[PDB]
Scaffold this active site. Structure first.
Site, mmCIF file in Angstrom:
data_model
loop_
_atom_site.group_PDB
_atom_site.id
_atom_site.type_symbol
_atom_site.label_atom_id
_atom_site.label_comp_id
_atom_site.label_asym_id
_atom_site.label_seq_id
_atom_site.Cartn_x
_atom_site.Cartn_y
_atom_site.Cartn_z
ATOM 1 N N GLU A 199 -1.322 5.795 -12.193
ATOM 2 C CA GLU A 199 -2.701 5.949 -12.715
ATOM 3 C C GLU A 199 -3.011 7.359 -13.135
ATOM 4 O OE1 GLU A 199 -5.583 4.252 -9.984
ATOM 5 O OE2 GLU A 199 -5.207 2.278 -10.776
ATOM 6 N N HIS A 242 0.880 -1.169 0.000
ATOM 7 C CA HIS A 242 0.000 0.000 0.000
ATOM 8 C C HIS A 242 0.915 1.216 0.000
ATOM 9 C CE1 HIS A 242 -3.448 2.510 1.445
ATOM 10 N NE2 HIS A 242 -4.289 1.487 1.329
ATOM 11 N N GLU A 285 -9.999 -2.706 4.876
ATOM 12 C CA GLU A 285 -10.687 -2.525 3.595
ATOM 13 C C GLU A 285 -10.566 -3.875 2.896
ATOM 14 O OE1 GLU A 285 -8.671 0.657 1.676
ATOM 15 O OE2 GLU A 285 -6.914 -0.546 1.073
ATOM 16 N N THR A 333 -12.527 1.435 -5.493
ATOM 17 C CA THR A 333 -12.115 2.187 -4.332
ATOM 18 C C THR A 333 -11.117 1.453 -3.427
ATOM 19 O OG1 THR A 333 -13.876 1.258 -3.076
ATOM 20 C CG2 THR A 333 -14.422 3.298 -4.180
ATOM 21 N N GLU A 371 -1.390 -3.240 -11.068
ATOM 22 C CA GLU A 371 -2.292 -3.150 -9.918
ATOM 23 C C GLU A 371 -3.608 -3.796 -10.279
ATOM 24 O OE1 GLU A 371 -5.319 -0.429 -9.296
ATOM 25 O OE2 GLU A 371 -4.399 0.473 -7.494
ATOM 26 N N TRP A 417 -3.023 -5.535 -5.278
ATOM 27 C CA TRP A 417 -3.163 -4.441 -4.331
ATOM 28 C C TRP A 417 -4.051 -4.877 -3.160
ATOM 29 C CZ3 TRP A 417 -1.028 0.276 -4.339
ATOM 30 C CH2 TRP A 417 -1.527 1.173 -3.387
ATOM 31 N N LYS A 445 -4.931 -2.773 6.797
ATOM 32 C CA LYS A 445 -6.046 -1.846 6.798
ATOM 33 C C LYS A 445 -7.356 -2.589 6.699
ATOM 34 C CE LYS A 445 -7.643 2.431 4.485
ATOM 35 N NZ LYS A 445 -9.009 2.048 4.153
ATOM 36 N N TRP A 485 1.987 5.249 4.611
ATOM 37 C CA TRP A 485 0.972 4.809 5.560
ATOM 38 C C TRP A 485 1.266 3.438 6.139
ATOM 39 C CZ3 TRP A 485 -2.506 6.264 0.948
ATOM 40 C CH2 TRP A 485 -2.891 7.598 1.019
HETATM 41 C C1 LIG Z 1 -5.309 1.581 -7.572
HETATM 42 O O1 LIG Z 1 -6.523 1.310 -6.885
HETATM 43 C C2 LIG Z 1 -6.410 1.146 -5.456
HETATM 44 C C3 LIG Z 1 -7.841 0.887 -4.961
HETATM 45 O O2 LIG Z 1 -8.291 -0.381 -5.432
HETATM 46 C C4 LIG Z 1 -5.844 2.413 -4.823
HETATM 47 O O3 LIG Z 1 -5.651 2.195 -3.431
HETATM 48 C C5 LIG Z 1 -6.547 2.872 -2.566
HETATM 49 O O4 LIG Z 1 -6.124 4.214 -2.561
HETATM 50 C C6 LIG Z 1 -6.914 5.009 -1.648
HETATM 51 C C7 LIG Z 1 -6.538 6.407 -1.900
HETATM 52 O O5 LIG Z 1 -5.141 6.587 -1.618
HETATM 53 C C8 LIG Z 1 -6.704 4.503 -0.231
HETATM 54 O O6 LIG Z 1 -7.451 5.275 0.704
HETATM 55 C C9 LIG Z 1 -6.718 6.118 1.525
HETATM 56 O O7 LIG Z 1 -6.096 5.343 2.553
HETATM 57 C C10 LIG Z 1 -5.308 6.124 3.449
HETATM 58 C C11 LIG Z 1 -4.542 5.230 4.380
HETATM 59 O O8 LIG Z 1 -5.444 4.463 5.146
HETATM 60 C C12 LIG Z 1 -6.219 7.096 4.189
HETATM 61 O O9 LIG Z 1 -5.434 7.903 5.045
HETATM 62 C C13 LIG Z 1 -6.986 7.948 3.210
HETATM 63 O O10 LIG Z 1 -7.974 8.734 3.870
HETATM 64 C C14 LIG Z 1 -7.683 7.104 2.135
HETATM 65 O O11 LIG Z 1 -8.259 7.924 1.127
HETATM 66 C C15 LIG Z 1 -7.183 3.077 -0.157
HETATM 67 O O12 LIG Z 1 -6.961 2.533 1.160
HETATM 68 C C16 LIG Z 1 -6.374 2.259 -1.192
HETATM 69 O O13 LIG Z 1 -6.834 0.912 -1.255
HETATM 70 C C17 LIG Z 1 -4.466 2.651 -5.469
HETATM 71 O O14 LIG Z 1 -3.889 3.857 -4.985
HETATM 72 C C18 LIG Z 1 -4.663 2.806 -6.948
HETATM 73 F F1 LIG Z 1 -3.425 2.968 -7.579
#
Ligand SMILES: *[C@H]1O[C@H](CO)[C@@H](O[C@@H]2O[C@H](CO)[C@@H](O[C@@H]3O[C@H](CO)[C@@H](O)[C@H](O)[C@H]3O)[C@H](O)[C@H]2O)[C@H](O)[C@H]1F
Length: 300
Positions: A136, A32, A266, A232, A225, A259, A264, A36
């Site tokens: 992306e 990730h 999610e 999301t 990815e 990914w 986390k 983070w």
């Molecule tokens: C390709 O897609 C994946 C999703 O399938 C993207 O990964 C997601 O990116 C989100 C945005 O960065 C991320 O959310 C963030 O997570 C942070 C750490 O917990 C939070 O602080 C933040 O508020 C939140 O928006 C998702 O957790 C993550 O799965 C990837 O970046 C893309 F390239």
């Protein structure tokens, strides 16, 4: 063993091949964001993924924005730790300039050029390294012809001055989905691949057909990815459609990185809370997604 055997990767007739000309398929994990969840990126966790999951590539997802490299460049040293672990472990490594909110790769192009100059100078005489110059690109105002291709035609020469022929993965429009436009207007470098990203929460039949269109133009594609959840990163695990995609990638010799490696809460996350950041996970410490992905790589 992996890198000793396959050695220098190249593109031949639109396919990833090894130094003896044989097709090779990479399968592994993406971190990730390193800003983070960087604690999961270390020699011991990567050694556990290599030995217990069977990974042969690891992707270091260095966000540029969202508290990443542009805000705090110390995360580049975590990329270096990952690259050095991959060299010591004899696996491939993807250095991912992980644009997202910064949706046009031109926004931080100067920083990207400097970063890729540094990494290719350090690591350009190792066969392990794969450069991913713009995770992306996204937005209707970011197109292949106008934004992404010219970006790549500035960054690729920087890398090539230090590293003449390790693989470079270039992102595509619409969050690395628009491989059609890239394939109709390809870059000149012979060792380039185009990124394609998918999420099993989206019905994928036409997206598979578009990957085939691209392949039919002689473009090489790396699935740098993908997730078992929605676009999301959350909202359920969709293992039926994930398996359809797994099989499609095997039929087409498509390399991939899932990914992501984090605890986390999610659905796309591979680990549960309490998972040790240095590996050794029990079954109960893998999430529904992680259990599935581990199975796919072990099967392979
Ligand atoms: C390709 O897609 C994946 C999703 O399938 C993207 O990964 C997601 O990116 C989100 C945005 O960065 C991320 O959310 C963030 O997570 C942070 C750490 O917990 C939070 O602080 C933040 O508020 C939140 O928006 C998702 O957790 C993550 O799965 C990837 O970046 C893309 F390239």
């Amino acid at each position: 063993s992996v890198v000793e055997e396959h050695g220098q990767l190249s593109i031949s007739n639109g396919e990833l091949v090894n130094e003896r000309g044989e097709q090779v398929q990479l399968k592994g994990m993406s971190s990730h964001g390193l800003q983070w969840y960087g604690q999961f990126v270390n020699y011991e966790s990567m050694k556990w993924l290599r030995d217990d999951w069977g990974i042969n590539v690891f992707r270091a997802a260095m966000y540029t924005s969202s508290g990443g490299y542009i805000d705090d460049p110390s995360v580049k040293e975590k990329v270096k730790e990952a690259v050095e672990a991959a060299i010591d472990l004899d696996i491939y490594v993807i250095i991912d300039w992980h644009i997202l909110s910064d949706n046009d790769p031109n926004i931080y192009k100067e920083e990207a050029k400097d970063f890729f100059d540094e990494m290719s100078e350090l690591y350009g005489d190792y066969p392990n390294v794969i450069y991913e110059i713009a995770n992306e690109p996204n937005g209707s105002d970011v197109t292949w012809g106008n934004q992404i291709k010219p970006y790549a035609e500035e960054v690729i020469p920087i890398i090539r001055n230090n590293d003449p022929n390790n693989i470079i993965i270039v992102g595509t429009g619409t969050w690395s989905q628009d491989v059609h436009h890239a394939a109709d207007n390809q870059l000149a470098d012979p060792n380039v691949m185009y990124a394609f990203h998918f999420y099993a929460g989206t019905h994928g039949q036409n997206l598979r057909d578009q990957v085939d269109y691209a392949l039919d133009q002689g473009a090489a594609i790396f699935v740098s990815e993908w997730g078992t959840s929605a676009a999301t990163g959350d909202g359920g695990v969709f293992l039926d459609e994930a398996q359809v995609w797994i099989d499609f990638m095997d039929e087409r010799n498509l390399s991939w990185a899932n990914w992501s490696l984090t605890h986390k809460d999610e659905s796309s996350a591979a680990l549960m809370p309490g998972a040790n950041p240095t590996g050794g996970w029990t079954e109960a410490e893998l999430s529904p997604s992680g259990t599935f992905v581990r199975e796919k790589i072990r099967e392979s």
